[PDB]
Amino acid sequence: MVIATIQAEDHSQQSGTQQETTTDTGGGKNVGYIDAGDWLSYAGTPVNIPSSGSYLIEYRVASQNGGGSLTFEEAGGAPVHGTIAIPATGGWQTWTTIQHTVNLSAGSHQFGIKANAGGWNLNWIRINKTH
Ligand SMILES: OC[C@H]1O[C@@H](O[C@H]2[C@H](O)[C@@H](O)[C@H](O[C@H]3[C@H](O)[C@@H](O)[C@H](O)O[C@@H]3CO)O[C@@H]2CO)[C@H](O)[C@@H](O)[C@@H]1O
Ligand SMILES: [Ca+2]
Numbered sequence: 269m270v271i272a273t274i275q276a277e278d279h280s281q282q283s284g285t286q287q288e289t290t291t292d293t294g295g296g297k298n299v300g301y302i303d304a305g306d307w308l309s310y311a312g313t314p315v316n317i318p319s320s321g322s323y324l325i326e327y328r329v330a331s332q333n334g335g336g337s338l339t340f341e342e343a344g345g346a347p348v349h350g351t352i353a354i355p356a357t358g359g360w361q362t363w364t365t366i367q368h369t370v371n372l373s374a375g376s377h378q379f380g381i382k383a384n385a386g387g388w389n390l391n392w393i394r395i396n397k398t399h
């Protein structure tokens with residue numbers, strides 16, 4: 269049911285953030301120092317959506333104090349697919365997976381993430397079928 273897993277650090281463009289080592293399962297890196305206005309683009313790795321309809325988007329996140337939120341969209345800002353609040357997890361390297369649904373059109377997508385409020389780290393994103 270997995271369409272794509274995208275490691276958050278594997279962006280083709282970004283604004284305002286920096287990579288750091290993660291102690292989450294699998295190791296590697298996460299994106300940190302996320303604040304309002306910051307963004308991540310995955311335009312360099314287009315993802316194919318096989319059919320129009322509902323998809324589940326998952327985010328592997330960590331947050332010391334909570335208060336964060338993001339917008340999932342096409343790279344460049346539009347169309348916007350959805351928004352999600354990012355809860356406190358207990359620490360900067362205490363990880364949990366959050367999710368929401370969005371509608372996506374069939375075909376090739378270039379995704380982006382805009383931080384509306386900071387306070388969180390991001391390890392990876394996953395796009396899944398519902399259907
Ligand atoms: O959706 C996230 C944010 O996107 C920002 O636009 C950027 C795109 O995400 C990014 O992919 C694009 O990259 C260009 C690159 O600048 C150019 O050198 C190359 O030839 O083509 C790439 C596109 O394939 O850059 C833009 C901004 O310059 C929005 O600015 C932001 O609002 C939005 O949240
Ligand atoms: Ca920042």
Ligand SMILES: [Ca+2]
Nearest residue numbers: 275276297391
């Ligand atoms: Ca990662």
